[PDB]
Amino acid sequence: QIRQNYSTEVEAAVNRLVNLYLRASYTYLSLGFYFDRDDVALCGVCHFFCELAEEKREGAERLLKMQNQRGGRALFQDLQKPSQDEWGTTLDAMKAAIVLEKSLNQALLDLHALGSAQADPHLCDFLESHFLDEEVKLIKKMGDHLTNIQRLVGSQAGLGEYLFERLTL
Amino acid sequence: QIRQNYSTEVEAAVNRLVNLYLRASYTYLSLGFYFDRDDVALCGVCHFFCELAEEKREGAERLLKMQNQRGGRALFQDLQKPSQDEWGTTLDAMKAAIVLEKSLNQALLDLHALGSAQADPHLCDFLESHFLDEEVKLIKKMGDHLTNIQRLVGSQAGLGEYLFERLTL
Amino acid sequence: QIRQNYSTEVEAAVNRLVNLYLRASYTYLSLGFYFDRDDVALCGVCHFFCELAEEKREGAERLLKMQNQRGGRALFQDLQKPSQDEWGTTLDAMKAAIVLEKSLNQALLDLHALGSAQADPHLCDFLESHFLDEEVKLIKKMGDHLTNIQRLVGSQAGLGEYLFERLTL
Amino acid sequence: QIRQNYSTEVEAAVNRLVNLYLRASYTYLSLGFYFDRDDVALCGVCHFFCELAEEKREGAERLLKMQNQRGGRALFQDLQKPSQDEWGTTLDAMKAAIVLEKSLNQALLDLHALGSAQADPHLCDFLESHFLDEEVKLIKKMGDHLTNIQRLVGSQAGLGEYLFERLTL
Ligand SMILES: [Au+]
Ligand SMILES: [Au+]
Ligand SMILES: [Au+]
Ligand SMILES: [Au+]
Ligand SMILES: [Au+]
Ligand SMILES: [Au+]
Ligand SMILES: [Au+]
Ligand SMILES: [Au+]
Ligand SMILES: [Au+]
Ligand SMILES: [Au+]
Ligand SMILES: [Au+]
Ligand SMILES: [Au+]
Ligand SMILES: [Au+]
Ligand SMILES: [Au+]
Ligand SMILES: [Au+]
Ligand SMILES: [Au+]
Ligand SMILES: [Au+]
Ligand SMILES: [Au+]
Ligand SMILES: [Au+]
Ligand SMILES: [Au+]
Ligand SMILES: [Au+]
Ligand SMILES: [Au+]
Ligand SMILES: [Au+]
Ligand SMILES: [Au+]
Ligand SMILES: [Au+]
Ligand SMILES: [Au+]
Ligand SMILES: [Au+]
Ligand SMILES: [Au+]
Ligand SMILES: [Au+]
Ligand SMILES: [Au+]
Ligand SMILES: [Au+]
Ligand SMILES: [Au+]
Ligand SMILES: [Au+]
Ligand SMILES: [Au+]
Ligand SMILES: [Au+]
Ligand SMILES: [Au+]
Ligand SMILES: [Au+]
Ligand SMILES: [Au+]
Ligand SMILES: [Au+]
Ligand SMILES: [Au+]
DSSP: OOOOSOOHHHHHHHHHHHHHHHHHHHHHHHHHHHHTSTTTOOHHHHHHHHHHHHHHHHHHHHHHHHHHHHTOOOOOOOOOOOSOSOOOSHHHHHHHHHHHHHHHHHHHHHHHHHHHHTTOHHHHHHHIIIIIHHHHHHHHHHHHHHHHHHHHHSSOHHHHHHHHHHHTO | OOOOSOOHHHHHHHHHHHHHHHHHHHHHHHHHHHHTSTTTOOHHHHHHHHHHHHHHHHHHHHHHHHHHHHTOOOOOOOBOOOSOSOOOSHHHHHHHHHHHHHHHHHHHHHHHHHHHHTTOHHHHHHHIIIIIHHHHHHHHHHHHHHHHHHHHHSSOHHHHHHHHHHHTO | OOOOSOOHHHHHHHHHHHHHHHHHHHHHHHHHHHHTSTTTOOHHHHHHHHHHHHHHHHHHHHHHHHHHHHTOOOOOOOBOOOSOSOOOSHHHHHHHHHHHHHHHHHHHHHHHHHHHHTTOHHHHHHHIIIIIHHHHHHHHHHHHHHHHHHHHHSSOHHHHHHHHHHHTO | OOOOSOOHHHHHHHHHHHHHHHHHHHHHHHHHHHHTSTTTOOHHHHHHHHHHHHHHHHHHHHHHHHHHHHTOOOOOOOOOOOSOSOOOSHHHHHHHHHHHHHHHHHHHHHHHHHHHHTTOHHHHHHHIIIIIHHHHHHHHHHHHHHHHHHHHHSSOHHHHHHHHHHHTO
8 A cells, every 4th residue: 555645635636637638638639620621721720739639638647647656546537528619710719728728727726725735745746846837838828829819810810810820830 | 556547537437337238238128028928929029128138238247347447446326127117019119229229329429428538548449349339230220120110010010010020030 | 818826916026026136136246346346356256246146137037937927017126226335355245145145035935925825836836946945055055155264264364365266266 | 652641750659669568578578587586486477477578579569560551660779678687576576567567558548649639540440459458458467466466465475475376377
């Protein structure tokens, strides 16, 4: 028995956070392939979301690895399908991405608060080292992208959307 | 005692010019971080101003080194905070930069005139070699940037501001 | 809007800590050039303080970068001139440096305490990763230097001050 | 006839400055060999003065080359023997060196003033580029050395003189 100072509440919440990361991954997969549609055709947007799908999956895998290291038991649930089948414009897609990220970030912070109430400093090191800083960086990048996309809407929206994909993504 | 042909008036004016260079450096620091804001998000503008902050600091350090070489005494004053907290558009920011540069250039020229009236040819060599030519080059570059920014304003200002940052900076 | 779990109190305190780092940087600049005076002439002491000026500036820049990442707004104040124009002996200068460092360290710890009361684990990761350990290391080094400088004072102070600069710095 | 805008007064003064540089060179030669005496035996001091002898000779040669370039006629006088046969301590020797340098520097400045009164901008470029900055640097270095030598005198003069030669020169 390896398990030590690892509460059942943390264990459960780690499994939920794994589910949220895989759901996010799945969302990004759907975002990526939407932008690869012949009638959408924004290669850079596709590559941005595909890369995020992978990062989110890796996140989940690190949580699972940590679950096992602490002697908790990974439990998997259904992955709920993404919230939309079609994601609109690059602007709409980037808004939906940042609301998704803010929800993951909130779940990370709820998990940190739970680890403080439970006195679980390994969990706290774990989240700090691999999640908190990265999520903040990602959200700042998405904010930056959103400000440039918005700046490019104005009167010529198609033009702005093309330029952004070519010169930023 | 090393001091030779170095007037108290030059000495004072060198300390003031050091203060002006560090103030300029501090202005550029504030300009750079304004453009790094998530709601401004113009990476190239940030990098242009950050680089200038550093060049201005180096300027100040060279003046200090020269002060010591002539046997004057460096005296430091408060660095006054930059003239604005938010710098508006890239156009506004580049105008404010060039007025700042013109003020440094005028201070350089007042110092040269003072060195001529005092018969201080080392000071004159010093300013010529490291300051006068560089300030002229920088101001010409900023003028060029300002003309391209203005050319890009027209009807689609957001578009122009994005393009300038991507294709020039 | 990227800002999430980032209090106005943390935001303010980050801006103040930036000011303290830049002030420290400016102090070290003045310490460095004092030791470069022809009538002081302690090259190693100059290089030690110059390097510190740079580290302190970098500190400030990292805080600013973090401010932007969390969606706070950087606000700059006057940089107050250093507490002295002439810094006495290497011993006096190293004492003044360590009191300065202890004040920065205290400000770092007040900021950590504020981040705990506000439940801001990103801020806590941030300070731990880049500031707390480094400040402790620096202070230990300065303590070591101070003990060797003091050991060298005794009867022949000029000799001790020369040796320290040649064989340690 | 190449000569253009080159006064007879500048020409004469260039020949005198050549004589001063060669005299200085000769002084340094004598300083160097004094420190190589078996009863003085300060290798680093010898190497410092030997190097200066060479720099001063090079100075003279550059002046001669410039004399010819402007179509003036080099005229050589006796080189007066150095002011002393024995140079005392490293402290005494470094004082005598800096008075010598200050005299060369004054002659450089008198020549610049003469070139301004004569409207001879080539002469002014010439002195600025190769002489003024270098003489200031050298004098600052000698001042630094003098401050460290003085710091090392105190009670144990022999010790201080040995250490300076080993750890600085
Ligand atoms: Au894709
Ligand atoms: Au793709
Ligand atoms: Au993909
Ligand atoms: Au935590
Ligand atoms: Au904890
Ligand atoms: Au914690
Ligand atoms: Au913790
Ligand atoms: Au984004
Ligand atoms: Au995006
Ligand atoms: Au990107
Ligand atoms: Au920047
Ligand atoms: Au930047
Ligand atoms: Au920067
Ligand atoms: Au001048
Ligand atoms: Au002049
Ligand atoms: Au001049
Ligand atoms: Au001149
Ligand atoms: Au510019
Ligand atoms: Au510009
Ligand atoms: Au540029
Ligand atoms: Au320094
Ligand atoms: Au230095
Ligand atoms: Au420095
Ligand atoms: Au904390
Ligand atoms: Au905390
Ligand atoms: Au904490
Ligand atoms: Au913590
Ligand atoms: Au220290
Ligand atoms: Au020290
Ligand atoms: Au050290
Ligand atoms: Au020699
Ligand atoms: Au020698
Ligand atoms: Au020799
Ligand atoms: Au001249
Ligand atoms: Au002239
Ligand atoms: Au001149
Ligand atoms: Au001139
Ligand atoms: Au010397
Ligand atoms: Au010397
Ligand atoms: Au030397």
